[PDB]
Amino acid sequence: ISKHTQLSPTDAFGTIEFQGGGHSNKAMYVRVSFDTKPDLLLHLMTKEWQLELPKLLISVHGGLQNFELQPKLKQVFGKGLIKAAMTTGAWIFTGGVNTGVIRHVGDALKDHASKSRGKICTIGIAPWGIVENQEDLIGRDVVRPYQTMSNPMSKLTVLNSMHSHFILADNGTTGKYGAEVKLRRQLEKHISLQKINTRIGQGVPVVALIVEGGPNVISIVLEYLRDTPPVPVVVCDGSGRASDILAFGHKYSEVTIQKTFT
């Protein structure tokens, strides 16, 4: 279909509670199209959710597959990320759906809230069509219970708990990705063009964090390193996939056949 989708006003926005989780948590979410202008989304995040402008932004692009990291490596990573986002008021941008590196971020937040105070504005931006319960989120301005238990036979991924705010994007499809990367990049670029409180004239710094991932990770990191406001990236050598491949290739900077890993 040549994107023949009807443009109707949205009818999904408000607060939910994660019934069944270990911690009773409240998160606020809306549902917007994939061509939404970033300025109005920034205004929504600023006034309707009472969020101040951050001093730092962290992007957690990773792999969308349930991969397990060995102990004494994921604990250090989780605690470091939580400390860096807690001492400095920062917006962690994640996928949001309970899959891949997002599950590791969720568990890292799980091990933090049980011991320490404070909140992290872990904004998740996920496509609308992948949630397990498409209904039950249609309630507007009203708290809606959500079932955190996920049955794999439904061929869908549930929203991850322990997040603070969600931004759901739709293009009319269901059960397929691809409707949030452009919106996420535009929102990040609009945030980086915003001005921090200091009158130096410096914008909000932006960094990117990479754990595991497939071949698209190389595309997004090469897009990051290209832009006129170029941003740095951080990878982890303990993952195993192309992030670890990029870590090994980081050595002997300037054997091209060893990449045939099949």
């Binding site: 019934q19 069944g20 270990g22 009773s24 219970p145 079932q147 955190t148 238990m149």
Partner: protein, 223 residues
């Protein structure tokens, strides 16, 4: 439907750690709890000894058939007896009695004429979902003399101070009743210790609430 049965087994056997693990592993008490589950929890035989049989014998006159099943109306009556004069539990209310009437009795479509009740089966999956399950869970834990289960169930849900005070009053009343009925004189000590611990928790929570904010804490005691 397997984790539900596992939760039921863990609830019956007084294994608090398994209940916490299952709650932290996906299952929820809102969907799990219902009339049948509660009325079979109140009639379990495993676990530590409890004084509920003597209380139900003392209520509803001194006689009782031996192989008797305790329903929720009997629990409401014994709770009202233990609490005080003007207390009025939710189970004995006409709404709950009419809702529980749909558990047995319409087996014969001609029988409802004979019974002649003066009485709506909403499309709720079963309208058999307790709105705040942890209240009834804490009441069950206190009435069956399971202190760890009660202390675990107390911290979830709403109305922590009200739950603590009600638990303290119930433990004190049960201690007095068991002392008057020539028990082993140690059950009285255990129940009194439970009452003192719950009262201390309520006092500490009030202290914390007053230390945090004056106006909300003042409103909490009077609403």
């Amino acid at each position: 439907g397997s984790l539900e049965q596992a939760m039921l087994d863990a609830l019956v056997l007084d294994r608090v750690d398994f209940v916490k693990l299952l709650i932290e592993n996906g299952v929820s008490m809102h969907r799990f709890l219902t009339i049948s589950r509660l009325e079979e929890l109140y009639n379990t035989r495993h676990g530590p000894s409890n004084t509920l049989y003597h209380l139900v014998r003392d209520v509803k006159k001194g006689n009782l058939p031996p192989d008797y099943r305790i329903s929720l109306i009997d629990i409401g009556l014994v709770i009202e007896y233990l609490m005080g004069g003007a207390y009025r539990c939710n189970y004995t209310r006409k709404r709950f009695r009419t809702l529980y009437h749909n558990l047995f009795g319409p087996k014969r479509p001609k029988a409802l004429k004979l019974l002649g009740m003066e009485d709506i089966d909403l499309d709720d999956p079963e309208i058999n979902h307790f709105p705040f399950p942890f209240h009834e869970l804490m009441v069950w834990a206190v009435l069956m003399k399971r202190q760890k289960m009660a202390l675990f169930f107390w911290q979830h849900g709403e109305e922590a101070m009200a739950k603590a005070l009600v638990a303290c009053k119930l433990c004190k009343a049960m201690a007095h009743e068991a002392s008057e009925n020539d028990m082993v004189d140690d059950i009285s000590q255990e129940l009194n210790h439970n009452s003192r611990d719950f009262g201390q928790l309520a006092v500490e929570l009030l202290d914390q609430s007053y230390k945090q904010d004056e106006q909300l804490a003042m409103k909490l005691l009077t609403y």
